[PDB]
Design a protein around this motif. Sequence first.
Motif, PDB file in Angstrom:
ATOM      1  N   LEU A 186       0.839  -1.217   0.000  1.00  0.00           N
ATOM      2  CA  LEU A 186       0.000   0.000   0.000  1.00  0.00           C
ATOM      3  C   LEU A 186       0.837   1.215   0.000  1.00  0.00           C
ATOM      4  O   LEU A 186       0.291   2.319   0.155  1.00  0.00           O
ATOM      5  CB  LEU A 186      -0.976  -0.054   1.203  1.00  0.00           C
ATOM      6  CG  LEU A 186      -2.048  -1.173   1.068  1.00  0.00           C
ATOM      7  CD1 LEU A 186      -3.158  -1.121   2.124  1.00  0.00           C
ATOM      8  CD2 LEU A 186      -2.644  -1.425  -0.345  1.00  0.00           C
ATOM      9  N   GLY A 187       2.160   1.103  -0.105  1.00  0.00           N
ATOM     10  CA  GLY A 187       3.049   2.237  -0.144  1.00  0.00           C
ATOM     11  C   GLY A 187       3.739   2.652   1.135  1.00  0.00           C
ATOM     12  O   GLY A 187       4.492   3.603   1.115  1.00  0.00           O
ATOM     13  N   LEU A 188       3.530   1.871   2.203  1.00  0.00           N
ATOM     14  CA  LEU A 188       4.155   2.216   3.490  1.00  0.00           C
ATOM     15  C   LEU A 188       5.442   1.388   3.738  1.00  0.00           C
ATOM     16  O   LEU A 188       5.376   0.142   3.816  1.00  0.00           O
ATOM     17  CB  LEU A 188       3.201   1.902   4.641  1.00  0.00           C
ATOM     18  CG  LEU A 188       1.875   2.732   4.614  1.00  0.00           C
ATOM     19  CD1 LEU A 188       0.917   2.250   5.715  1.00  0.00           C
ATOM     20  CD2 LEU A 188       2.151   4.261   4.809  1.00  0.00           C
ATOM     21  N   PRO A 189       6.487   2.085   3.987  1.00  0.00           N
ATOM     22  CA  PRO A 189       7.762   1.427   4.302  1.00  0.00           C
ATOM     23  C   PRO A 189       7.849   1.089   5.776  1.00  0.00           C
ATOM     24  O   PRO A 189       6.962   1.471   6.607  1.00  0.00           O
ATOM     25  CB  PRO A 189       8.756   2.490   3.942  1.00  0.00           C
ATOM     26  CG  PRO A 189       8.144   3.683   4.479  1.00  0.00           C
ATOM     27  CD  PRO A 189       6.618   3.514   4.151  1.00  0.00           C
ATOM     28  N   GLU A 190       8.879   0.298   6.095  1.00  0.00           N
ATOM     29  CA  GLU A 190       8.871  -0.397   7.356  1.00  0.00           C
ATOM     30  C   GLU A 190       8.962   0.581   8.497  1.00  0.00           C
ATOM     31  O   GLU A 190       8.433   0.257   9.553  1.00  0.00           O
ATOM     32  CB  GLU A 190       9.971  -1.485   7.441  1.00  0.00           C
ATOM     33  CG  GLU A 190      10.814  -1.541   6.222  1.00  0.00           C
ATOM     34  CD  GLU A 190      11.874  -2.610   6.351  1.00  0.00           C
ATOM     35  OE1 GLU A 190      11.502  -3.759   6.737  1.00  0.00           O
ATOM     36  OE2 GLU A 190      13.060  -2.291   6.087  1.00  0.00           O
ATOM     37  N   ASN A 191       9.548   1.750   8.305  1.00  0.00           N
ATOM     38  CA  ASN A 191       9.642   2.708   9.396  1.00  0.00           C
ATOM     39  C   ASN A 191       8.310   3.407   9.788  1.00  0.00           C
ATOM     40  O   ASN A 191       8.230   4.217  10.699  1.00  0.00           O
ATOM     41  CB  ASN A 191      10.822   3.682   9.213  1.00  0.00           C
ATOM     42  CG  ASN A 191      10.570   4.743   8.133  1.00  0.00           C
ATOM     43  OD1 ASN A 191       9.596   4.716   7.400  1.00  0.00           O
ATOM     44  ND2 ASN A 191      11.529   5.681   7.999  1.00  0.00           N
ATOM     45  N   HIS A 192       7.256   3.058   9.054  1.00  0.00           N
ATOM     46  CA  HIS A 192       5.884   3.525   9.385  1.00  0.00           C
ATOM     47  C   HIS A 192       5.021   2.455  10.028  1.00  0.00           C
ATOM     48  O   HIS A 192       3.771   2.622  10.086  1.00  0.00           O
ATOM     49  CB  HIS A 192       5.180   3.947   8.095  1.00  0.00           C
ATOM     50  CG  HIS A 192       5.570   5.295   7.621  1.00  0.00           C
ATOM     51  ND1 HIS A 192       6.872   5.661   7.372  1.00  0.00           N
ATOM     52  CD2 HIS A 192       4.804   6.399   7.355  1.00  0.00           C
ATOM     53  CE1 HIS A 192       6.906   6.941   6.941  1.00  0.00           C
ATOM     54  NE2 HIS A 192       5.679   7.399   6.905  1.00  0.00           N
TER      55      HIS A 192
END
Lengths: 171, 6
Positions: free
Chosen positions: A153-159
């Motif tokens: 969905l476009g979220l990288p792991e730091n989110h």
Amino acid sequence: LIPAPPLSKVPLQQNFQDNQFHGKWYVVGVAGNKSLREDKDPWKMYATIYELKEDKSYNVTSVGFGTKKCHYKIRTFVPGSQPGEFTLGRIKSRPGRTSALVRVVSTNYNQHAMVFFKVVQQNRESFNITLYGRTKELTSELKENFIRFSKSLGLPENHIVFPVPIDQCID
Amino acid sequence: VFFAED
């Protein structure tokens, strides 16, 4: 703010069963489109109880621990355009407030659920995916799958955050 | 406290 994905990228649980999604869930993962400052207090696990009513809405009660006291949040989710989708609120946005769209992406009802939310509050937009569990235990293969779905969905792991399990307030 | 969902 990472832009929200189009709803065509968000699965909807097939043959959603409202009376099986009923009950208590712990918030065991969250992935959302803002921020994450490492210089903070860890996000504590909380619980949400979905009580299905005869009118097919849910009365939705969250309970959590602040610093020193328990907090509660009560609101109604009303069925949306298809089974497994909901919107916030019986009457659509009064004076100045919050609106939300809710889509249940996947659940097996007795163990976990992944639920997508888009939210507007004070004209500010955000979205998140919430990972719910019937218990507090979260094992690695489900953490991995939630990270993969979140990245889709476009979220990288730091989110992505896995809230800390606690005993106060939530059971 | 209620950082996910709606």
